[PDB]
Paper text:
Here we describe the two-component-like orphan response regulator RitR (Repressor of iron transport Regulator) as the archetype of a novel family of peroxide-sensing transcription factors in the pneumococcus and related species. RitR contains an Aspartate-less Receiver (ALR) REC-like domain, which retains the common (α/β) fold of canonical REC versions, yet lacks “invariant” residues in its catalytic pocket required for typical phosphotransfer, including the phospho-accepting Asp residue crucial for the histidine kinase-response regulator phosphorelay.. Here we show that RitR regulates pneumococcal iron homeostasis in response to cellular peroxide concentrations through its single Cys (Cys128) located within the linker domain of the protein. Atomic structures of RitR in its oxidized and reduced states demonstrate a dramatic mechanism of activation that hinges on the helical unraveling and subsequent formation of an inter-protomer disulfide bridge to enable DNA binding and transcriptional regulation of Piu.
Residue numbers in the entry:
A (entry chain B), B (entry chain A): 2 to 230
The structure:
Amino acid sequence: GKRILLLEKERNLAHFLSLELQKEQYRVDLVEEGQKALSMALQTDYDLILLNVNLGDMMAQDFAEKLSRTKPASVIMILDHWEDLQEELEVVQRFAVSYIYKPVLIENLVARISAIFRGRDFIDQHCSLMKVPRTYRNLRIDVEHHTVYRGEEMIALTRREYDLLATLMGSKKVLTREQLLESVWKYESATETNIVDVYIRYLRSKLDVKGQKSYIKTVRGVGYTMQEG
Amino acid sequence: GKRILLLEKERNLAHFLSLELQKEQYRVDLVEEGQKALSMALQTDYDLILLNVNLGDMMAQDFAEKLSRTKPASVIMILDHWEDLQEELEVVQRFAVSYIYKPVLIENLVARISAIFRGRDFIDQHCSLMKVPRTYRNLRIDVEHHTVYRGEEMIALTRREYDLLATLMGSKKVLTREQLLESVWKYESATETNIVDVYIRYLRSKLDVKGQKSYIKTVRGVGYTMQEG
């Protein structure tokens, strides 16, 4: 459950925004004083802090600079009317992840907050996009359908097998059993590298053709890679 | 929101398992018939299908074989008692992404499903295999706290600045503004390439030092990348 700190000076809006955010299963701490919002953000890591340009007892810009002393990458979004935001736009753009104008439909606001959260979560997986190979010899990879064809024949690779093939095709360098573990079984706390050899064998038995070189190369030393034909 | 097809013969466990999965914001379709489970799996793409070894009107092995005609990389996990799973283990190991024994703690099962999901997403987003970069020149990245140090000095990068620096550091290649948009503003629908240039300048003003090369390299007419010292 993502945690949100909410200081909104229009109490009617605050109430209904809080309700809709909770409907999305976010946790909402509603607050009303700048200095108490700051003390709360210092002691609690919020996934999002939603503020107006002027908090009452301080400006959002001062809130953000103070907080930044210890939590410099804090996720702050500003919600305000046109004139208030326009007057401070340049500074808001510096400290705020995003800003949105009142008057505001709550659903558009909740939608923007969800986008920010997804975008932050994507950065947090350290996913460096790389170009995907879609052929190898007479194998065709249909990435959108997670299907594989040998010539025109669909090969019914399971998910794990599909994943193993893609990991091998994705690396020019040979991969160790350990690197394969950390790839195809990433996040699962897998220990035995012996399961790698089970699934190589499953993979070969689906792909390889008799009289032909195997599509998978065993580098007896180190690990596995794809087998040039 | 990840979608799960759940056919568990023990209705008490099924009920609580469904609730705990929903708390992670997963959508759970509870079923009780193997034939209905199959018809649902053909007509909608589930991220995970959770089954016992025997579905009642058919074996999970038959379910998987029929499904694999259309959807060969379907994500199927088997939950069952020792004797049921042991008796079918070799077969299950071929068609199932994973298996887990009853009696089972719900919290353990949710954690394993979540891991499997993240593992599929790493493959499906074509993330590089390389380790997240944590240094560049005299920069140190504390990934857990989203903080950055230049020497011993903490630089107060904003979340957006941080995400941008991470995306640049994440890629050996030059990134175009369109690529930077699609990663640092992923899901935010941004279409103005101009904002990338604005945050590059913000990043430089925080990191760069007089009489040093900039940490960021402008590649005229292409995009941006990191700047060797």
